[PDB]
């Protein structure tokens, strides 16, 4: 429809998944709010537009089409008003900074040590599968009450939910181009139900300190629980992004540091720089790259585009974090970049609820990794490939060290 952007008609889903940064570099210059045909949606690509849409009183949350097919209702990311307020009040207690600080060290540090002991003397490792993902899912899984769900299974679940929730491609008529791509999401949800329904049955009668037990009971009249159908979509939301993203953030931060060997050495030598390294890592390759959206509630003009009411806008925060209006050479990882605001945790009333927790998980994991393997080096025989448009991270991270 927009004539000068006719080249967007030839952008493919595979291209965006393999590397979205060249298309989005053009979008940020040509059309900070642009309709991308293969995605079937307007997309916000700059920091100014993403922040404006995410915080505007004329927009509210909406789930992406593939997200809605994957999660249903009421996914915390896709609802508003009283339901959103209730779901926020449900999840926020265990994520409060004063609460996290009471137990985060005793949670994550023994988990990190357990996985490190399996390989720290091998001299080689694939850190995504052997360390980053397991620590991320084991830490959250224990907090949630899924202690008996193996980390291999949690990792499989977030991979399947990832592919289902980012199965966004549409055809010429706006219909999903790959309808078969939701089936493995449906299979994961069925497996999750078989595992979690007995745990809920038990928590209803015998509450404990697990987060899901508290989701059932907190704030409820005596003897009542939230219906499991009301909380399952937020359980699924956790089993995708809350499980996946801290592992993604760790791994991207390591890849970035390896790209700047002088900076990797600084951080190993001075672990107090790890939080700064992670913040730059999240900006440099945002784990949640383009997974959420908002919808206009009235006619509104954004970046020169007059949008009717009811218009969805995808928030490509991963592109916003390479906005050259804010950052110098954003495609380069730079630990010594001035610490500026970033959008890797989103913005507004639907901004990430788990920032403080996530930052500590990533911090502790990297502290223990560098303590156990100070001479870590990247395996330069194997290149690092990143994959993902909705969620983005390295598919593997082969490293070596002198034993």
Distance of CA 281 to the CA centre of its chain: 13
Q: Tell me how far CA of residue 348 lies from CA of 174, 316, 391, in angstroms.
A: 29, 15, 20
Is residue 294 marked as binding?
yes
Segment (H or E) for 88: helix 81-91
Question: Does 241 contact ligand OKE by CB under 6 A?
Answer: yes
Is residue 88 marked as binding?
yes
Question: Does 240 contact ligand OKE by CB under 6 A?
Answer: yes
HSE (side-chain half, CA atoms, 13 Å) at 82 = 0
Question: Does 140 contact ligand OKE by CB under 6 A?
Answer: no
Least gap, CB of 258 to ligand OKE (angstroms): 27
What's the token pair of residue 123?
A: 């001299």
User: Which residue has its beta carbon closest to ligand HEM?
Assistant: 346
Is residue 317 marked as binding?
yes
Q: Tell me how far CA of residue 255 lies from CA of 94, 128, 357, 395, 397, in angstroms.
A: 30, 11, 22, 11, 8
Yes or no: say if 178 and 167 are a contact pair by the CB < 8 Å rule.
yes
Nearer to ligand HEM, 8 or 369 (CB): 369
What's the token pair of residue 154?
A: 């949690």
Q: Which of 165, 344, 361, 366 binds ligand OKE (CB under 6 A)?
A: 165
Residue 67 binding: pick among ligand HEM, ligand OKE, none (C-beta 5-8 Å cut-off by kind): ligand OKE
Nearer to ligand OKE, 140 or 300 (CB): 140
Q: Which residue has the tokens 């009411």?
A: 309
The Cα 368–Cα 74 span in angstroms is: 38
Nearer to ligand HEM, 120 or 245 (CB): 245
Q: In 218-369, where do the E strands start and end?
A: 292-296, 300-302, 305-307, 312-315
- Please report, to the nearest 10 degrees, the dihedral formed by the alpha carbons of residues 33, 36, 39, 41 taken in order: 40
Nearer to ligand OKE, 77 or 365 (CB): 77
Least gap, CB of 160 to ligand OKE (angstroms): 13
Question: Does 67 contact ligand OKE by CB under 6 A?
Answer: yes
Question: Does 116 contact ligand OKE by CB under 6 A?
Answer: no
Least gap, CB of 212 to ligand HEM (angstroms): 12
Task: List interacting residues with ligand HEM (CB under 6 A).
Answer: 54, 76-77, 88, 91, 95, 140, 241-242, 245-246, 249, 282, 287-288, 292, 315, 317, 344-348, 350-354, 357-358
Contacts with ligand OKE by CB under 6 A lie at 67, 77, 165, 237-238, 240-242, 288, 291-292
């Amino acid at each position: 429809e927009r004539p000068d952007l006719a080249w967007l008609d030839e952008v493919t889903m595979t291209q965006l998944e393999r590397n979205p940064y060249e298309v989005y570099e053009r979008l940020r210059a040509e059309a900070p709010l642009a309709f991308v045909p293969v995605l079937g949606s307007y997309v916000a690509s700059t920091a100014e537009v993403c922040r404006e849409v995410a915080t505007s009183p004329d927009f509210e949350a909406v789930i992406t089409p593939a997200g809605g097919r994957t999660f249903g209702h009421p996914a915390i990311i896709g609802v508003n008003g009283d339901i959103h307020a209730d779901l926020r009040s449900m999840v926020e207690p265990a994520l409060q900074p004063a609460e996290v600080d009471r137990w985060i060290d005793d949670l994550v540090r023994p988990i990190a040590r357990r996985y490190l002991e399996r390989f720290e003397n091998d001299g080689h490792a694939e850190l995504v599968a052997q360390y980053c993902e397991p620590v991320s899912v084991r830490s959250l899984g224990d907090l949630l009450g899924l202690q008996e769900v193996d980390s291999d299974k949690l990792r499989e679940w977030f991979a399947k939910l990832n592919r289902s929730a980012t199965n966004a491609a549409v055809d010429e008529n706006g219909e999903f181009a790959n309808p078969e791509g939701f089936a493995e999401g449906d299979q994961a949800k069925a497996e999750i139900r078989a595992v979690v329904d007995p745990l809920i049955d038990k928590w209803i009668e015998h509450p404990d300190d697990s987060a899901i037990s508290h989701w059932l009971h907190d704030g409820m009249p005596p003897g009542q629980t939230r219906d499991r159908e009301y909380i399952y979509p937020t359980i699924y939301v956790y089993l995708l992004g809350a499980m996946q993203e801290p592992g993604h953030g760790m791994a991207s931060t390591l890849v970035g540091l390896f790209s700047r060997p002088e900076q990797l050495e600084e951080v190993v030598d001075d672990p107090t720089l790890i939080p700064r390294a992670i913040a730059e890592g999240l900006r440099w390759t945002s784990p949640i790259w383009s997974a959420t959206a908002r919808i206009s509630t009235k006619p509104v003009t954004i970046a020169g585009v007059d949008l009717p009411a009811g218009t969805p806008v995808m928030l490509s925060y991963g592109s916003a974090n390479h906005d050259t209006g804010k950052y110098e050479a954003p495609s380069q990882y730079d630990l010594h970049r001035p610490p500026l605001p970033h959008l890797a945790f989103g913005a507004g009333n639907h901004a990430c609820a788990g920032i403080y927790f996530a930052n500590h998980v990533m911090r502790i994991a990297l502290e223990e990794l560098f303590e156990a393997i100070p001479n870590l080096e990247r395996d330069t025989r194997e290149g690092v490939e990143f994959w993902g448009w909705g969620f983005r991270g390295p598919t593997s991270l082969h490293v070596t060290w002198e034993v």
